[PDB]
Amino acid sequence: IVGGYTCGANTVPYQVSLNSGYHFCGGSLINSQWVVSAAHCYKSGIQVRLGEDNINVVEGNEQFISASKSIVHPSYNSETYNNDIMLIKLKSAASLNSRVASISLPTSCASAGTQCLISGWGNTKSSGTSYPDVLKCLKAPILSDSSCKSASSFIITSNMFCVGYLEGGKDACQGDSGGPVVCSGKLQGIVSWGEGCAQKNKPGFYTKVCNYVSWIKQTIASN
Ligand SMILES: COC(=O)[C@H](Cc1cccc(C(=N)N)c1)NC(=O)CNS(=O)(=O)c1ccc(C)cc1
């Protein structure tokens, strides 16, 4: 997260770290057994880490639970990043408490202009590289279709939305991928892609979670 702030320990209790010997992506706990992340974060050997603040120190509120299976969206297109969503099932149920909690799926899509919370342990620099050990947070608005479409030379689909500031300085970044965008109290986005981080006229692109609720519910009903 570039241009954000230290969240405070366990203030974002649905935020998870995905660990394959090291932190590589974020995710969101949606119930005691399932995490939503980005399809581009797929890999084998995932351990889900719940209740984290400092990812490099055991502070006492963590739950480390291995993934049993990962399910990439059936239409995920790595060429275009269309349908950049993945479900991760836990080998055992998380113990839900004040510091480890689920975030609900949306009933309706969030509206342009809504302020959202984006969080993660990703790079904090627009130029260069600095990784924080504690969880970082950013509040930023959903952009119009017009601004989002015109914001990249690359292909933009109806399953993506933009959040941030066209003037630059505030954005998600490398290592934030897969993590949550919470708007109107529900999980509305997944950190998906961007051109660099926090650059002028180059906002973040996010998976539009409200388009996937049927697939998520059907999938978790049978796995
Ligand atoms: C990988 O390095 C980076 O610093 C950012 C990471 C990133 C990840 C998620 C969200 C954001 C964000 N700013 N909201 C940033 N990604 C890139 O900079 C990748 N862009 S890119 O322009 O380098 C690029 C473009 C197209 C292809 C096929 C591959 C790579």
Ligand SMILES: [Ca+2]
């Ligand atoms: Ca820790």
